[PDB]
Design an enzyme around this catalytic site. Structure first.
Site, mmCIF file in Angstrom:
data_model
loop_
_atom_site.group_PDB
_atom_site.id
_atom_site.type_symbol
_atom_site.label_atom_id
_atom_site.label_comp_id
_atom_site.label_asym_id
_atom_site.label_seq_id
_atom_site.Cartn_x
_atom_site.Cartn_y
_atom_site.Cartn_z
ATOM 1 N N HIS A 43 -9.240 32.361 41.489
ATOM 2 C CA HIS A 43 -10.423 33.472 40.573
ATOM 3 C C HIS A 43 -10.837 34.146 41.427
ATOM 4 O O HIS A 43 -10.705 35.727 41.498
ATOM 5 C CB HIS A 43 -10.328 32.241 39.560
ATOM 6 C CG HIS A 43 -11.450 33.356 38.993
ATOM 7 N ND1 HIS A 43 -11.310 34.672 38.048
ATOM 8 C CD2 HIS A 43 -13.302 33.699 39.354
ATOM 9 C CE1 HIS A 43 -12.096 35.002 37.749
ATOM 10 N NE2 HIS A 43 -13.087 35.174 37.693
ATOM 11 N N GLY A 52 -24.574 43.105 63.007
ATOM 12 C CA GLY A 52 -26.090 42.324 62.730
ATOM 13 C C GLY A 52 -26.832 42.588 61.311
ATOM 14 O O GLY A 52 -27.689 42.690 60.916
ATOM 15 N N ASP A 55 -12.508 37.343 64.534
ATOM 16 C CA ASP A 55 -13.930 37.164 64.858
ATOM 17 C C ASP A 55 -14.232 36.950 66.348
ATOM 18 O O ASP A 55 -13.392 35.480 67.325
ATOM 19 C CB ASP A 55 -15.077 36.798 64.250
ATOM 20 C CG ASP A 55 -16.805 37.346 64.578
ATOM 21 O OD1 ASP A 55 -17.842 37.322 63.920
ATOM 22 O OD2 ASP A 55 -16.817 37.897 64.940
ATOM 23 N N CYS A 105 -7.140 32.702 35.217
ATOM 24 C CA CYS A 105 -7.247 33.090 33.859
ATOM 25 C C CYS A 105 -6.180 33.019 33.006
ATOM 26 O O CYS A 105 -6.740 33.662 31.345
ATOM 27 C CB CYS A 105 -7.867 34.542 33.835
ATOM 28 S SG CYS A 105 -9.438 34.224 34.703
ATOM 29 N N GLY A 110 -16.360 34.575 67.750
ATOM 30 C CA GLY A 110 -17.285 33.283 67.937
ATOM 31 C C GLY A 110 -18.358 34.139 68.747
ATOM 32 O O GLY A 110 -19.193 32.976 68.348
ATOM 33 N N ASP A 165 -15.563 40.951 54.561
ATOM 34 C CA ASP A 165 -14.997 39.566 54.346
ATOM 35 C C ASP A 165 -16.306 38.899 54.053
ATOM 36 O O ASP A 165 -17.592 39.677 54.421
ATOM 37 C CB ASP A 165 -14.753 39.064 56.466
ATOM 38 C CG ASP A 165 -16.219 39.291 57.399
ATOM 39 O OD1 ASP A 165 -16.259 40.100 57.858
ATOM 40 O OD2 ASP A 165 -16.325 38.197 57.056
ATOM 41 N N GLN A 202 -24.204 47.170 66.962
ATOM 42 C CA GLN A 202 -25.503 46.854 67.262
ATOM 43 C C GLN A 202 -26.922 47.345 66.919
ATOM 44 O O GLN A 202 -26.372 48.592 67.054
ATOM 45 C CB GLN A 202 -25.173 45.374 68.060
ATOM 46 C CG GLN A 202 -23.907 43.945 68.386
ATOM 47 C CD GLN A 202 -24.775 43.613 66.421
ATOM 48 O OE1 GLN A 202 -25.792 43.607 66.049
ATOM 49 N NE2 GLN A 202 -23.331 42.634 66.597
ATOM 50 N N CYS A 247 -9.756 39.601 34.250
ATOM 51 C CA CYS A 247 -8.660 39.666 34.895
ATOM 52 C C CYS A 247 -6.647 39.009 34.673
ATOM 53 O O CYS A 247 -6.837 38.448 33.974
ATOM 54 C CB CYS A 247 -9.670 37.932 36.023
ATOM 55 S SG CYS A 247 -8.586 37.580 37.351
ATOM 56 N N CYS A 299 -5.419 36.769 36.612
ATOM 57 C CA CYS A 299 -4.668 36.224 37.997
ATOM 58 C C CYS A 299 -4.305 34.983 37.214
ATOM 59 O O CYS A 299 -4.820 34.737 36.064
ATOM 60 C CB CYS A 299 -6.190 35.905 39.108
ATOM 61 S SG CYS A 299 -7.384 34.185 37.930
#
Ligand code: AIQ
Ligand code: AIQ
Ligand code: ZN
Ligand code: ZN
Lengths: 366, 366
Positions: free
Chosen positions: B333, B214, B92, B307, B94, B264, B187, B302, B304
């Protein structure tokens, strides 16, 4: 495998190297046992603990009896299933943390208020059974240092009475007696005659292994080595010798030179999280500004995954930033370093060059 | 691979699924990017992040420019080498954390006092270059919610001027322009006309991808979805659409239904450490006493590693005990759950049954 079988493959002076065969796996000695406090070796998955080379871990009982609880863990299937470690687990009796972490003592045991509980030889053994411990430690009373001959004798004598009670409680539980092993603990402070009386009492009772307790309580390495010099030879030669709570690298080498086969210490894990990393050239504190742009791995020879992938500069950043990955990386490296030390010890003894290894190790480490 | 190539393989309504090819790897869209604060995805080794299915991670710039520092990381070889992640990294600008974590704003940029520093479009782009970012974000000004039309317009207009400056700074650095990509940020708060003006300005300038900024600032999902309805169609259709800071599972599904390709959020990591675990039947707080003896895995479906190996009871114990392994397990997880969600989204779109998947997901999750 058998319930318990200790075999000595090679020796050099007082040092020995061999194996302890148990139902859940084989333990190579001299061995180092990572300490798991609260059903976990701090910041490491069990597979990572195994990857470093550990054959067995130590489970803190005192902590587990308080949370999540012995009965609960048993209900959930045992400590092994609970934390995901299917190899041997040695559990302490809790007779140490109680008189230091939380108390009224009596010949029957110890009652305390968690940081209202009672702990006796019988309950300690039962708790270790409920946890599914492979190597059960007799319930003793660690003698505070310094200790007058009178107090050391009284404490040692009580521990021997408790050792007999631990033995009987263990034997009276068929499932436990047939699948686990029981270790007795030698007490007697720094006094030779008390250590001898304790050793004789323990041998008279009979145990699968013998621990040297009461040391690493602030006596200094010199004094510790002096006590080991005359104390270890008192224990049965054909059974494992376990020095409780001793872990500094140099402490370990010196103890093995004096006949010790097993060790445990929170140093590698606790120090790791604090910024201390062990190297063959001595420990370093990774937080030091001198490591901010050091691209070298923690240790130049270490074969652990941390030293293969990350730099001192990165770990320096992580630790000073308080990141969890910092603790994870530092801990994995430290435990791997300890295991590599034990491997070098085992190999040198097997090859009759341990004394030389001990001297070379010290020269470079210091 | 090429510097940047976004290809749309399949579509359903406004939803799209495809790939972004970059020099360091391929990114499957819709994609979820785990957030790495301070050069680390909290409590996880890079290999674990990759194991969950992540193709790219987000690097927090604001934090890195303060510690360890952009110049330092560059000197050490770049962020990828530094943290051990060799795949794409989006950074990003910042321009958000500064106005929230530490300040004087001006047309030239923002000066602040870390929790004495200046940050401008030019410096932001330079910092991302020094870090070795693969996807560079233009330096913008996130508009606070609620915002009056006048303030939203002023902020949006400044962001567009800064977008042009970001573009030129990026293009003037040969190494960066040839190996990385640059995303512009839309924006305009919740106002349609401002969003349109912003979209047109960004398209006029030209970027490799377009982010919708935004939002996720306290407007509520209903309002967020309303703004997305008219905002995403304004962006170039043949380039990736990135919704910054949006991560609740249901938020993601709804955003994809509205044309978003990238996400994200710190939710999976932050919540994980706080005790919240995502499941197909909704999130659960593992600290709840009801899980003290629950032997089932965090989620029944799941796949993973957490699990497959540990129970809710164990993780419950770890978290309430404040153990690092608790954070590690919960985080792995949660991130794996998010990746599985993205995979289910990608697959359903490719098979023209995403709308149905969206409805089934909501029915069970709520
Ligand atoms: N030094 C020491 C350490 C421990 C705990 S093992 C351990 N130490 C640190 C973590 N775990 C001891 N335990 C018992 N039961 N008796 C002892 O005499 C004794 C002595
Ligand atoms: N919601 C949101 C989140 C982020 C940060 S990405 C992030 N969020 C949380 C962790 N990381 C944003 N960043 C910029 N530059 N501009 C925005 O408008 C904006 C909006
Ligand atoms: Zn190492
Ligand atoms: Zn899972």
């Amino acid at each position: 495998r058998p319930r318990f079988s200790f075999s000595i493959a090679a020796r050099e002076g007082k040092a020995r190297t061999g194996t302890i065969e148990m139902k859940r796996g084989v333990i190579r000695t001299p061995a180092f046992m990572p300490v798991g406090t609260a059903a976990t070796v701090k910041a490491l998955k069990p597979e990572t603990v195994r990857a470093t080379g550990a054959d067995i871990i130590l489970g803190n009982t005192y902590h587990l009896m308080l949370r999540p609880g012995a009965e609960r863990i048993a209900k959930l299937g045992g400590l092994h299933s609970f934390m995901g470690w299917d190899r041997p687990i040695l559990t302490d009796s809790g007779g140490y943390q109680v008189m230091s972490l939380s108390t009224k003592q009596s010949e029957e045991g110890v009652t305390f208020k968690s940081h209202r509980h009672m702990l006796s030889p019988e309950r300690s053994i039962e708790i270790q059974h409920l946890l599914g411990s492979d190597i059960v430690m007799a319930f003793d009373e660690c003698t505070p240092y310094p200790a007058t001959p009178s107090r050391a004798a009284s404490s040692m004598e009580r521990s021997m009475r408790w050792a007999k009670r631990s033995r009987d409680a263990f034997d009276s539980r068929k499932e436990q007696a047939e699948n686990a092993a029981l270790f007795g603990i030698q007490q007697g402070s720094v006094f030779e005659n008390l250590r001898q009386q304790s050793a004789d009492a323990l041998a008279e009772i009979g145990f699968d292994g013998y621990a040297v307790g009461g040391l690493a309580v602030g006596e200094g390495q010199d004094e510790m080595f002096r006590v080991l010099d005359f104390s270890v030879p008192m224990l049965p030669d054909d059974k494992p010798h376990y020095l409780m709570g001793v872990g500094k690298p140099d402490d370990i080498v010196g103890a093995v030179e004096r006949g010790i086969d097993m060790f445990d210490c929170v140093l590698p894990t606790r120090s790791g999280r604090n910024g201390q990393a062990f190297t063959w050239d001595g420990p370093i504190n990774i937080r030091n500004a001198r490591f901010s742009e050091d691209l070298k791995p923690l240790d130049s020879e270490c074969h652990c995954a941390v030293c293969q992938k990350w730099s001192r500069a990165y770990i320096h950043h992580l630790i000073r930033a308080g990141e969890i990955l910092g603790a994870m990386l530092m801990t994995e490296h430290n435990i791997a370093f300890y295991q590599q030390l034990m491997q070098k010890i085992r190999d040198s003894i097997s090859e009759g060059r341990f004394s030389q290894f001990a001297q070379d190790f010290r020269a470079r480490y210091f």
